[PDB]
Amino acid sequence: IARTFFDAPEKNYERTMAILQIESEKAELRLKELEVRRLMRAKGDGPWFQYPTIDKALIDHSPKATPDN
Amino acid sequence: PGIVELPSLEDLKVQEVKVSSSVLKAAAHHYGAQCDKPNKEFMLCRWEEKDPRRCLE
Known about the structure:
The structure is cut from a larger assembly and holds chains A (69 residues) and B (57 residues).
Chain A: H1 9-43
Chain B: H1 21-26, H2 28-34, H3 36-49
PDB class: proton transport
Keywords: Complex I, respiration, NADH, proton pump, mitochondria, iron-sulphur cluster, oxidoreductase, membrane protein, Quinone, proton transport
Entry title: Complex I from Ovis aries, at pH7.4, Open state
């Protein structure tokens, strides 16, 4: 029975170790993503939460009809 | 904020061209032809400095 159907205890041991490593990595990445999102929302210096502003390529630079501008 | 600086009343004192609009219009072409250099210098200073206090002279 243990030879045909069942799995070796070493296989289950090392498989559980692999699963635990992957899931701990995922949990740490989730917590880091939460902290990054909070910091980017608070400070606004990152690539996220970049609300748009007025593009400065629209400003006319040629001399106008009045000098005082 | 700051204090705006204005020239004194003696610096704005000059004798004027006391002629009417039609007197200016009759000789407008010859005035543009003959007196062009100081007029264009003043206009360049005006459009560059964007400040009449820097173009008073």
